[PDB]
Each structure stands twice: as C-alpha cells, then as structure tokens.
Amino acid sequence: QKIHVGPGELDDYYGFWSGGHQGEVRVLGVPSMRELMRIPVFNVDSATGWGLTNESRHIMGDSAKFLNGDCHHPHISMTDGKYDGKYLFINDKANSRVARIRLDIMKCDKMITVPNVQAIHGLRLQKVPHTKYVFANAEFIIPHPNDGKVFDLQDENSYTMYNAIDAETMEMAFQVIVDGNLDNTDADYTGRFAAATCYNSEKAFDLGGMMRNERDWVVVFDIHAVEAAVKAGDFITLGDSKTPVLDGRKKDGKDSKFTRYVPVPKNPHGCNTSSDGKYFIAAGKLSPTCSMIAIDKLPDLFAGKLADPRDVIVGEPELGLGPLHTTFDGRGNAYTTLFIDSQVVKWNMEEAVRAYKGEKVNYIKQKLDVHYQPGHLHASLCETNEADGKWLVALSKFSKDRFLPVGPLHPENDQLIDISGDEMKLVHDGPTFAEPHDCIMARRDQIKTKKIWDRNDPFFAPTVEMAKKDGINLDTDNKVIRDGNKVRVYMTSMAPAFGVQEFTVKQGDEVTVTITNIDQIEDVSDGFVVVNHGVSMEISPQQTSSITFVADKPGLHWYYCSWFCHALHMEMVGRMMVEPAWSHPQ
Amino acid sequence: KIHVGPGELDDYYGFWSGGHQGEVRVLGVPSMRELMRIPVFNVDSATGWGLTNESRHIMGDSAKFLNGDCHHPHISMTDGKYDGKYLFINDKANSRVARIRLDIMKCDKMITVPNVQAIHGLRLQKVPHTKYVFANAEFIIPHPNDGKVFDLQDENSYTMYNAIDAETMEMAFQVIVDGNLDNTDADYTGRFAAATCYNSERDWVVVFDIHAVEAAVKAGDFITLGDSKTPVLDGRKKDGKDSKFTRYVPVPKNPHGCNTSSDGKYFIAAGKLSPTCSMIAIDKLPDLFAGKLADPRDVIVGEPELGLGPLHTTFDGRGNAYTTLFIDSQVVKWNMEEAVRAYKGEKVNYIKQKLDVHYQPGHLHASLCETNEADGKWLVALSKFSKDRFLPVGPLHPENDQLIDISGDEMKLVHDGPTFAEPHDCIMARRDQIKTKKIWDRNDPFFAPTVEMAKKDGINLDTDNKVIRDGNKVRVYMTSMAPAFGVQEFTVKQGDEVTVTITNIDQIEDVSDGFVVVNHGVSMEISPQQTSSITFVADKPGLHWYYCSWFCHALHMEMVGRMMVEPA
Numbered sequence A: 001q002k003i004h005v006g007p008g009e010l011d012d013y014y015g016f017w018s019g020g021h022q023g024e025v026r027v028l029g030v031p032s033m034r035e036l037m038r039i040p041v042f043n044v045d046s047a048t049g050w051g052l053t054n055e056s057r058h059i060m061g062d063s064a065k066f067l068n069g070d071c072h073h074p075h076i077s078m079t080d081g082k083y084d085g086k087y088l089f090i091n092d093k094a095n096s097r098v099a100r101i102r103l104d105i106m107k108c109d110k111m112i113t114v115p116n117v118q119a120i121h122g123l124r125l126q127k128v129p130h131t132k133y134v135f136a137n138a139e140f141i142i143p144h145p146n147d148g149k150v151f152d153l154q155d156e157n158s159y160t161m162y163n164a165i166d167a168e169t170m171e172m173a174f175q176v177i178v179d180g181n182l183d184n185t186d187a188d189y190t191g192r193f194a195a196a197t198c199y200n201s202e203k204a205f206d207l208g209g210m211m212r213n214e215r216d217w218v219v220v221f222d223i224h225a226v227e228a229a230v231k232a233g234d235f236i237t238l239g240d241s242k243t244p245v246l247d248g249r250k251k252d253g254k255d256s257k258f259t260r261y262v263p264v265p266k267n268p269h270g271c272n273t274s275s276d277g278k279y280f281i282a283a284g285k286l287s288p289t290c291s292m293i294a295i296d297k298l299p300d301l302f303a304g305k306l307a308d309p310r311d312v313i314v315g316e317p318e319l320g321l322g323p324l325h326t327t328f329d330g331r332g333n334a335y336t337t338l339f340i341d342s343q344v345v346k347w348n349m350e351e352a353v354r355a356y357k358g359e360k361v362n363y364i365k366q367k368l369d370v371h372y373q374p375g376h377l378h379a380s381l382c383e384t385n386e387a388d389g390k391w392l393v394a395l396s397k398f399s400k401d402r403f404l405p406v407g408p409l410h411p412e413n414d415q416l417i418d419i420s421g422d423e424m425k426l427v428h429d430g431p432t433f434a435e436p437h438d439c440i441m442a443r444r445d446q447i448k449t450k451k452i453w454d455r456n457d458p459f460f461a462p463t464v465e466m467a468k469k470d471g472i473n474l475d476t477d478n479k480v481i482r483d484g485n486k487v488r489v490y491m492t493s494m495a496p497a498f499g500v501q502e503f504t505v506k507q508g509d510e511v512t513v514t515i516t517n518i519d520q521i522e523d524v525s526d527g528f529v530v531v532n533h534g535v536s537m538e539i540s541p542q543q544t545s546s547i548t549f550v551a552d553k554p555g556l557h558w559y560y561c562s563w564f565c566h567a568l569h570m571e572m573v574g575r576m577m578v579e580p581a582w583s584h585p586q
Numbered sequence B: 001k002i003h004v005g006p007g008e009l010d011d012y013y014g015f016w017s018g019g020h021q022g023e024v025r026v027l028g029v030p031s032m033r034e035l036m037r038i039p040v041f042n043v044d045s046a047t048g049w050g051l052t053n054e055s056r057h058i059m060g061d062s063a064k065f066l067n068g069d070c071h072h073p074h075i076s077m078t079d080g081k082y083d084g085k086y087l088f089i090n091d092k093a094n095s096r097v098a099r100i101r102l103d104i105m106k107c108d109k110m111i112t113v114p115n116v117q118a119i120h121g122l123r124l125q126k127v128p129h130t131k132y133v134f135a136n137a138e139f140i141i142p143h144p145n146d147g148k149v150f151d152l153q154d155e156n157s158y159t160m161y162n163a164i165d166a167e168t169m170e171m172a173f174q175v176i177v178d179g180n181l182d183n184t185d186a187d188y189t190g191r192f193a194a195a196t197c198y199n200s201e202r203d204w205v206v207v208f209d210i211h212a213v214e215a216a217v218k219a220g221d222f223i224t225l226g227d228s229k230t231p232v233l234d235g236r237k238k239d240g241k242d243s244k245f246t247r248y249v250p251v252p253k254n255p256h257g258c259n260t261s262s263d264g265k266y267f268i269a270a271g272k273l274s275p276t277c278s279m280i281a282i283d284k285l286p287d288l289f290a291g292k293l294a295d296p297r298d299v300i301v302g303e304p305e306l307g308l309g310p311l312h313t314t315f316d317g318r319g320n321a322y323t324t325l326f327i328d329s330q331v332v333k334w335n336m337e338e339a340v341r342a343y344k345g346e347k348v349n350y351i352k353q354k355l356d357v358h359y360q361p362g363h364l365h366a367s368l369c370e371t372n373e374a375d376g377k378w379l380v381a382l383s384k385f386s387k388d389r390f391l392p393v394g395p396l397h398p399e400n401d402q403l404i405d406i407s408g409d410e411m412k413l414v415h416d417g418p419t420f421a422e423p424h425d426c427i428m429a430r431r432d433q434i435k436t437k438k439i440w441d442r443n444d445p446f447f448a449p450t451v452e453m454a455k456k457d458g459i460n461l462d463t464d465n466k467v468i469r470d471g472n473k474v475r476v477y478m479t480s481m482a483p484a485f486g487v488q489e490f491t492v493k494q495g496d497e498v499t500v501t502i503t504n505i506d507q508i509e510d511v512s513d514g515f516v517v518v519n520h521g522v523s524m525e526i527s528p529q530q531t532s533s534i535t536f537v538a539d540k541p542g543l544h545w546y547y548c549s550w551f552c553h554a555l556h557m558e559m560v561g562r563m564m565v566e567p568a
C-alpha cells in the first residue's frame, strides 16, 4: 500500500475532518493527509466571505449573529448502506445547530438551529434504505419551558431530547424525550432502529453525581413506532415549535412504545454500528469494556419476548483503560481507542461474543501505542457495508513532543495507520488545529465535484430574485440602482476588470454590491474587498455573490480583487466615492 | 531528505501568510505539515481571538472588522540574522500591521496605519536590528480624504511609505512618494530601504535615505496629516528637483519584487513586464544621494534577461539568485556576479537552470534568505494555479506551495503542498532560532489589562472563585483545573452584562481548557497559567449550560457549569 503521494500523484481517498471548536469542515487527501480545502460552516471566513455575504447569512438565518461553532461529527449521506456522495452533515455543540454541506460545490447550503434543546453533540445518519433522517443528540438537560422559573434538573419537565431532521429539507422531523441525557448515536442497516449512549442517567450537574450509577445505558429508538405515532397525531409540541414531540421516558418503570433502555457501564461514550449490521457497540469509558448489543434481538426486545434488557447484550469484552470509540475493518475485527492506556486495540467481534458465553478465547489481536490519548478513530468506509479495511485514523488529543514546540497551545495528533494486513502499522503523524474530533473518508470515486457553478444554483437563487425586482439581468448588467438611502450595485466580473469600476454614494448609504463572475474557465476565482470597511468575498466562475455594508466614511475608497486571477491582478480595482453628509439633507 | 516520520521532528519552522483568510500559520519544514494557526485579522472560534477582551484590546477599534488580507510575513533581525523575537505581517484589506510574539505564538500588537489605504508590501530593517517595520500603502488617495476632492491627480492625492517602530508598534514616520508602492526591502546597514513603484516604458524603484529622514524628524522638519501625530516627510520630486529623502531609479517595467541579496550587495527588482531583473548596487547609493553620479541609472549594475514574467527573487547564500517566472511557470537559478559582468558586455552565461513549477509561481523563499546566514538548503515556490496537481474539491482550488531542494547544483522538486486562501508568501527559520514558552508567564503583557481589572475588584486571579456584582454588570472570576471549573454555577438577571474571567492553574504542558456558553456565541481558550476573559449579555432567561471545549481529561464531557438567568 502506497503511503507517500509524490509530486503529480493524487490521493486515493477524500477525508472530511471536523474543525472542532474552530467551526469549519476540512477536506483532506488520504493517505498524504494534506489539507485540500476548508469549508466554512459555523466560523466567519475572511477569504470566501462566509458569514459576511448575504447568501451565507441567509443560510445561517438568525444564527448568523454568532461567530463561533463547535463541530465534532461529520457524516456522509448514504443509499442502501453505502455512501452516495450527496451531502455531509455536521453538528454544532456551541450554538445547537446542524449544518448540511453539498459535496458537489463543497459549501454549506443549509443550517438549522434545533429548537428547544441545548448543545448538539452526537450526530449520525440513517443508513437504510437511504439517509432520510439525520439523527442528532442534544446533550444537556434543560427546563421546559426554560423561562427562568424552574432551574432544577430533577423537575418532571427537565429533560433533553433525541432529534431527527429531514435530511433533504433540513427541517425538523420529530423529537423524542428521553430519560437521562445523550452522548453519541448510530443507526442500524434496516431503518427501524437507532441507538444512543447516555452518561448522565443521574440527571446530575456535578462531577460526582454524573458518575454515581454503576451503569447508565444505551437508549434504543424504534423509529417505525415513532413515525406511526406522528402519522396518528399522537404527539405534543413545545413552545413555538411545530416539531412533533414524542415521550420516550419510562413512566413508573413502564417502557415507552418508542424506546428501550439497555443498561451499560459506565458513562459510556462511543456508539458504533458494525459494518455487517450485527451490533451496536458502546464504549464503556469509565468501564474497561465495550458492550455489544445484538441488533437482531431488538425486535424481540421491543416485543416483550426477552425478560431483561441486558438480554440483548451478547458481548462485553474487557479491552483496557478508557475505551472511547470503535471502528471496523469489514473483516470481522473491531478497533477501539483506549484513552487512558493511549492505544488502539484490535479485537475479533465473533470471538468476543463466544467469550461472553464462557468459551475462554483471546479475542484481542493487537494493541498499538498512539501518541497520545486517542478519542475517535475511523477506518475507511467503516460506516457502510463496503468497509474496506485499508486505512485507519486515530485522532489523539495530546501531541506533547511529537511535533516542534509552538507555544503553550499544542496541535492534535491524527495518526494514519495501515490496517490492510494482520498487523496494524503506524505510518504518519498528522498535526491538526483546534481538535478535530472525528473524520470520515470516502473513495475518490464516491465524490463528484462541480468545477463551475450552475446559474440556477439554489445557493444564490434568492439573490437572483432580488436582482429581478430591479429589472437586472445578472449575466450582462453593470448598473447602479438607487433607492432612497439604499444603493444596489450590480456588476459582472471578467478578470482583470470589474464591470463597474467606480460608483458614487451619499455618506450613510447602505450599499449592496452584487458581482457575477461571467468567466467560463476553471480555477479563475475573483475576489472583492472594500478597503477599511470590513468587506471581503469570493466569486467563483458563474457564481453570483453579494455583500452589504454602510458607507460610513466620506471620501474616496478603493476596492480590489483579492483572489489572484491574472498577471494584471494588482490592477483589477475600483473606487467608491462617498459624498459627505454635510453636502446632503440633514 | 524530506520524510519526517512518526516521532521525528522537522528541522525548520515555516511561517505562512494566511492570505485572504487573515491568520498566520506555523508549518514544520521539510514535512510541510501545519503545526499551529495564529489568529490575527480573522475571528477564531477556537481560541476566541476577536471575541475575548484580551484580543479585542490588542485589535483596538479594528476589532469591528472580521476580515484581513495577508501577504508578507517577516521575522525580526539583530545584526542581519533572525533573532526569534517577532513576526510582522500586513493587512491589505483594513490597512493594518500586526506583530506576533514568537515565544507565545500569538498576535500581541496591532496598528491601523493612519491616512493611507491598503498595507501591502512589508519588510524589516536588518541592521543593526529591526528598529523599523517598513510598510507600503498601495493606493493613492486624497489628503484630506473628506469627500471634497476625489481627483487622483490632485496635488494632494498620493500614497506614502510607512515606518512603524517595531518595539512600541507606534508609527515612526511616513514619506510621501510619487506613484504607487509595490514591494520593499532594506539594506544591511540601516541607512537605506527601497521599494518598487508602478505608477507615474519605465517605472522606478524609489530608494529611501532613512538616515536623512531620521535627521529631519529629530530637527522637527516635518508636517502632520489630519489628527495623527505621525511625522510626515515629502519624498516627491518637485519641479524635477529631488527630495533629500528619496531617489527614483528608473527600472523596467511595472517592476514587482524588491529583494535584498544576502551578501548585502544588491536591491534586485523583478521586471514583471520586462523579462529581466534590475540589480541596484547598494554601495553606489551614498554617491547617488551625494550628487556624485551623473544619472540615477548609474546605480544599476546588472539587468539579466531571465524569462517571461519575473516576479520575485531569493538567494542561496552561495552567490546564486532564484527568480520566479510567472508566464514561463518556472524558477530560474542565476549567478549574480556573472550577471554583473554580462551587463558590462562580457560573454558569460549567468543562467544555471530552469525548473518547471505548477503553475504560475509568485513569491519564492529560500531558507534564511533575508539574513547574512542564508544557507542554501530549501526553497519554496508558491504557485497560483494548482490545476490537476491535487484531487478536485469544487470550484475553488488550493494554492500549490512546492518544496524544492537547492542544496546541490541541481534544483530538485520534492513536495507539492496545497494551501488555503492564497498564502502568497512565507518565511523559514532554523529550529534553533525559535524558542517558545511551554506554559504562560503570570506577568505576561498579553493579559496584563485583565490582571489590572482583577486588581480593581480585589481579586487574586491565582486562587479566587468569586462573583462580583456591580449594577447590571456581573464579573465572574474563577480558576480552572481539568476536569472542573472553579465556579460551576452562578445566577444573574436577564439583560446583565456578564464578564467571565478564567485562570487555568494547571501546570502540565498541553492541558489547555476551553469555555463555551451554549447558544450565546461565546468561546475561548485558556492554556496553562493563562488568564482569558470574555464579555456577553445574558439576554435569555432560564438555565444556560457552559462547558469546556478543549478535550482535557477522561472526564472532559463532564467539565461543565450552569448560568441561571432570572427573568427581567
């Protein structure tokens, strides 16, 4: 297996890294581990204007007021248990959002603030028959309503909820109230079942309180039951949200139609569906184990055919100190991070299952040291029935001395590991900024990107409609529209000339500049910066982009093209002239 | 030798401009891996730069801008060698210069350059040390720019060359020039600096007699512009008569790069539209300013013909120059002293090799090239169009930063490094030239204004966990020690303005903490022994969780707290 990609060779896989609390998504080539692109999501990006442009702020909605995000869990949409390359979804723990990225244009095209919850953490996608739902955990228990009269987490109306978002429309589909809280989640290979770990069955707010119970659980959701209750109108709504809300709590020990609670030690964390569809595997964290839930026993469990919820557990291998996450090679082996022991442990799932039946067998095949304190790990195509067993990335949280010193803040260490054979081999240390938690890999042939925009792309269709109200044809027009104290500049750009090279406004005018890059050539992006006004954005071929700012300073103000485009790139410039307020009314 | 395997360390630091994204990036060389991001003009969700009170204090009023446009990173020097103290960088978008402290890898000072638009070219005094940062303002504007005069040919429409005091990060002086400024460099004595100029067959490089500028400032022979106290000197020609501060050397044509050879002999201006570089002999500049030379062209001692679109030049310390050819898409290696002999008319081929790069190179940078220790080992060429060199990633493409081995007689291409938002230029330093702190100093100036605020409240930041009430303002102070915040709950009134100040009292390297207030747009870093603070308004009643964002401990998910907001 080639590990080094020389000049002129291409990577074999795409990698999509979460940006952690930096808030973006990063596109890597694997196995070189080089960053090919950054996709802004919850961050404000100076380069492309994401968070400054009207198109990006329209997608972010009211949450455009936040300049931060905290993303952990990127996942690729699936059809019949295989990646289909349409969408990537990712969470925001900081401001309780889910974002969707279109993989053809490599941009965030949709974003939703999940109603009536705090902190979207766990996120994964339905696998079968396709990604109809995005499943997302809200991690923190809050009052309902959270109006400041009740603060107690033990009140009967304090809880968190499991969230399902319609993947295609990016509107809420339903929410399920749960006992305890929610950490990570995954889905089966049928569409009926999803599952989430819980670490706060105690509903506590202190460290000792959250660690009291010897077992918390993984809560299993019967999605067919949930959908059936929605179609029946058997639901409530919270606050001003019309989202159907179903109650998955136990009441006096009697189970809900929608959930079952499988006791699992202890503050369990990762929740990972094996690629053969046989198991939900929960990592025991404070317990030196993983618990293997047999998905084929779940129908009977929900049908009352088992006496004890623990009867769906068919394995609980002892692996080492601080198991956090598990991934799969598609050869029947699982790979789990040990945060405390600072290792990845390779183990055989079927042999673990036989040991749980008392058959003394050594299911542990290898422990590999990693550097240091691994969190997530990801094997290539592990989330699909095509899991290919070639590459493994372990994402470690302390790099210590593995890289040159760079001051008190250190990089993370995302280590590439060859698992194509019986022996795991560490091949590359990848330093990264701001804690990627998880990543996801796709084959080169599973991702198809556009090279030039379609003029009808929904990303800027609202801007096209604004232009139409002004009688503007964006592919041709270079015009300044005046409207009271609003000025709407429309121009084409064809390097090295802006189609409008100067325009005049009154001090205090609200100026919108809309630029349509009518170039037809690949890799010729234009840019637009207004000097000393905090204005910057990208305009790629056939894209329309727009930005709005106040001309608060009298005088002459230069604008220029930022994205290098030409040998005469230094000279693609223009001038905004701002007449002083004292020469105009009031 | 280019492979840095697991457990092995890079030999050099690379400091990459963040381009239109606004940050500075620290790379390991030769692996070309990104070790750290240093936020400067961008708002960084991870560390809170642009959100925290410490960062917004450094940014000043320019904290209102969320963008920057970076190009030209340079490291401070003592005796013509990197001293590892500071990195400086430009902001073309909002006309700023920022200083980065290389011991903490943070931006610690920032200035908006008065009465100019767009800081682009930037380089440092070399000798006797980096007393001044020299910065080009690119665009001609009216003076004053108050909306009465828009005419760019007006006698009071011009741009200026800028000198910033490197140590105080206050303006030192400004010099009015004819034309537009492009790039700039400085000599190895401190007397001279030079810049290419591209407005008005032939443009020029303007040479500054900094000694003459300094003498005028000290005698009070200057004006000021607007409400800035910056001394302003007039370096324009007047009725064909020269300033005492400047000489204009004719150089073809729309010249671009302006690079000082590491032997100190030449300012080398890249010809761009002319397939040449022009070599200005620095040892002839005293005679030029003394009126001893018949013609400003007499300081030109070489004009090698190199190829189509020369843009920038760097040096191996062995006597060779390396120049990017933007149109031919190559790096050309040539011998400077042989070029000088050719200019006198000898038949001698000064061109040694042309190496194809991919594609359209702009800046290039050889290791230690800006110092008299230029070591001839590594060369990075930064190319604008990566085309098919990397996997496709949609309509936007990465820059291709290519690593080239120049240690022997033949340049060898060894690595293609894709980068985001057109870094444009970079600088390298030996590992042993950079010395960084493992943990913060409690007296560090970076958070000294916060320590002062704490003092007024009677707070010992190293020990206290206290909530101060002051009208509708609430100032929370706490220590943090993974996995526990020192204040785990507090209660305020709806509408209160809450400041949270956190001191990480861990002493273990790499155990950084974070602080995020859910659904309030609040995020920041607190590394070992740092104090960080952030201010927000509690505009939502109810219970609102806060949590640690930096994975710090097996119990990281559980390092949380509660803010309770009583309805108005």
Ligand code: CUZ
Pocket (backbone or CB within 6 Å): A072, A073, A121, A122, A269, A270, A324, A325, A375, A376, A437, A438
């Ligand atoms: Cu958010 S948690 Cu193990 Cu995923 Cu990092």
Ligand code: CUA
Pocket (backbone or CB within 6 Å): A495, A496, A525, A526, A527, A561, A562, A563, A564, A565, A566, A569, A570, A572
């Ligand atoms: Cu268009 Cu530079």
Ligand code: CUA
Pocket (backbone or CB within 6 Å): B482, B483, B484, B512, B513, B514, B548, B549, B550, B551, B552, B553, B556, B557, B559
């Ligand atoms: Cu403190 Cu994570």
Ligand SMILES: [Ca+2]
Pocket (backbone or CB within 6 Å): A199, A200, A201, A202, A210, A211, A212, A213, A215, A216, A266, A267
């Ligand atoms: Ca628990």
Ligand SMILES: [Cl-]
Pocket (backbone or CB within 6 Å): A184, A185, A269, A270, A271, A272, A325
């Ligand atoms: Cl997980």
Ligand SMILES: [Cl-]
Pocket (backbone or CB within 6 Å): B183, B184, B256, B257, B258, B259, B312
């Ligand atoms: Cl230069």
Ligand SMILES: [K+]
Pocket (backbone or CB within 6 Å): A397, A398, A399, A410, A411, A412, A435, B551
């Ligand atoms: K870390």
Ligand code: NA
Pocket (backbone or CB within 6 Å): A059, A061, A110, A111, A112, A113, A170
């Ligand atoms: Na939305």
Ligand code: NA
Pocket (backbone or CB within 6 Å): B058, B060, B109, B110, B111, B169
């Ligand atoms: Na300042």
Ligand SMILES: [Zn+2]
Pocket (backbone or CB within 6 Å): B071, B072, B363, B424, B425
């Ligand atoms: Zn440059």
Ligand SMILES: [Zn+2]
Pocket (backbone or CB within 6 Å): B256, B257, B311, B312, B362, B363
């Ligand atoms: Zn240049």
